[PDB]
Amino acid sequence: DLRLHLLLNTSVTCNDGSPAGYYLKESRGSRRWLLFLEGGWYCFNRENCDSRYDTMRRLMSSRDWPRTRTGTGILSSQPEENPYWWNANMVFIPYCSSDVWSGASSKSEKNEYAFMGALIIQEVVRELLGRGLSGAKVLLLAGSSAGGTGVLLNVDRVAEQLEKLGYPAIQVRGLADSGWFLDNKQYRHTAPTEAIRRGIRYWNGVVPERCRRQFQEGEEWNCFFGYKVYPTLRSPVFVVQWLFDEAQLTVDNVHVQEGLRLYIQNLGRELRHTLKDVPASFAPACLSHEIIIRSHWTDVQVKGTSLPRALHCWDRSLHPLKGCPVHLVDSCPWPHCNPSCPT
Ligand SMILES: O=C(O)CCCCc1cccc2ccccc12
Ligand SMILES: *[C@@H]1O[C@H](CO)[C@@H](O)[C@H](O)[C@H]1NC(C)=O
């Protein structure tokens, strides 16, 4: 079980001004630290943030969080469930900022909600150094869905924060699960681009520095898209992405005749193309959403290699390897052409 700590700096808050926090399970003598960013969509204006506060309040407030959480999947401490990092220090960072982990804006007289995702991550990293993170060799910043995109937006800032804090020996790495999206055309029109452009303004959202310098003012929304932000990042990042992600299909208004068949097959081919130059990646041809904190995340395989194995091989490469691949992208063109897809 992971134990809740609310942030001692209570100026770093969830949407409604309640303190943000993290769940921690320490593993003595391990120098590996896994900080996992929860996902759960976002809200981009007052009206739809008000709606989310009614029916998704735990994603906007710590007032009702439980004292504990069970670590599952890559957060499990049992080798049977987590062959990769079962002995690591485990941190689960609840998503309570509704900003894809990009915000740095306090709740004030002019803002009904605080959007502080990017500062929550920094504050968690700050307060953990006193609980053992100072001795770490590896800090793996992981995340699923909106949290996977949050890895891409924050991993280099976590590295820079630890460098200027005097810890250049901590190797910061990223693991982005189901946060690698395409700014593509919808199957039936009316869409992520405009929602993110409004979100960034509404949140005062911040993006990684080099990506921001390429796309410049007014165009920061581009850096929320994995295939655009990833080549600008310095930290090593492992990308896990279903070829037919359910959240991708949702925003594409896909819920089978030729037109839809071609649209789906072209989507999978476009996703494969954006991953061709990502050296550490795991991308199975399944219709699904998230994987790394699911208890049965050991079950899926690409070209006969599981995700926990691919992650271990990635570890080794950061010391090609024989029989230990790190780039695993399905080539088959339709959901569940991979037989190990989740049922
Ligand atoms: O958090 C979840 O479960 C949903 C997935 C994350 C939100 C999201 C959905 C669709 C497209 C996106 C594009 C960029 C960032 C985020 C995008
Ligand atoms: C608390 O967090 C805010 C936001 O990052 C920061 O401006 C302030 O310096 C922090 N205070 C302390 C005591 O850490």
> If DSSP states are collapsed to H, E and C, what string results for 17-74?
CCECEEEEECCCCCCEEEEEECCCCCCCCHHHHHHHHHHCHHHCCCCCCCCEECCCHH
Site to substitute for ligand 2 among 8, 11, 13, most atoms within 8 A of C-beta = 11
CA distance 266 to 39: 26
Instruction: Produce one character per residue of 110-131: b if its CB has 16 or more CB atoms within 10 Å, e if not.
Output: eeebbbbbbbbbbbbbbbbbee
Q: What does R_g of the chain's alpha carbons equal in angstroms?
A: 19
Active site residue 336: no
**Residue whose entry in the numeric block shows the structure tokens 């960034």:** 200
Residue type, 176: A
* 8 A C-beta contact, residue 296 and residue 342: yes
Q: Which helix H or strand E contains 250, and what residues bound it?
A: helix 246-251
Provide residues with CB under 6 Å of ligand 1.
Answer: 39-41, 100, 145-146, 149, 181, 192, 196, 224-225, 247, 251
DSSP secondary structure code for residue 123 in this structure: H
Residue type, 124: V
* 8 A C-beta contact, residue 4 and residue 66: yes
Q: How far is the CA of 11 from the centre of ligand 2 (A)?
A: 7
**Backbone torsion region of residue 54, taken as left when φ is above 0, otherwise alpha when ψ lies between -120 and 50, otherwise beta:** alpha
CA distance 247 to 251: 6
Q: What is the DSSP string of 285-343?
A: S-EE---TTSTTTTS-EETTEEHHHHHHHHHHHT---TT--SEEE----STT-STTS--
- Token duo for residue 62: 């710590």
Active site residue 1: no
Q: Which helix H or strand E contains 262, and what residues bound it?
A: helix 258-274
CA distance 190 to 94: 32
Could you tell me which residues come within 8 angstroms of residue 27 by beta carbon, excluding any fewer than 6 positions away?
77, 87, 88, 89, 90
Given the residues 99, 156, 177, 245, the one annotated as active site = 245
CA distance 216 to 298: 41
- Token duo for residue 271: 């996703």
DSSP secondary structure code for residue 217 in this structure: T
Enumerate the H helices of 113-231 as residue ranges. Answer: 117-129, 146-164, 192-203, 209-215, 226-229
* 8 A C-beta contact, residue 187 and residue 135: no
Residue 9: CB within 6 Å of ligand 2?
A: yes
Structure's resolution in angstroms: 1.9
Cα of 79 vs its chain's centroid, Å: 23
What method was applied to determine this entry? X-ray
* Alpha carbon nearest to ligand 1 atom 5, residue: 145
Q: How far is the CA of 100 from the centre of ligand 1 (A)?
A: 8
Beta bridge partners of 245: 288
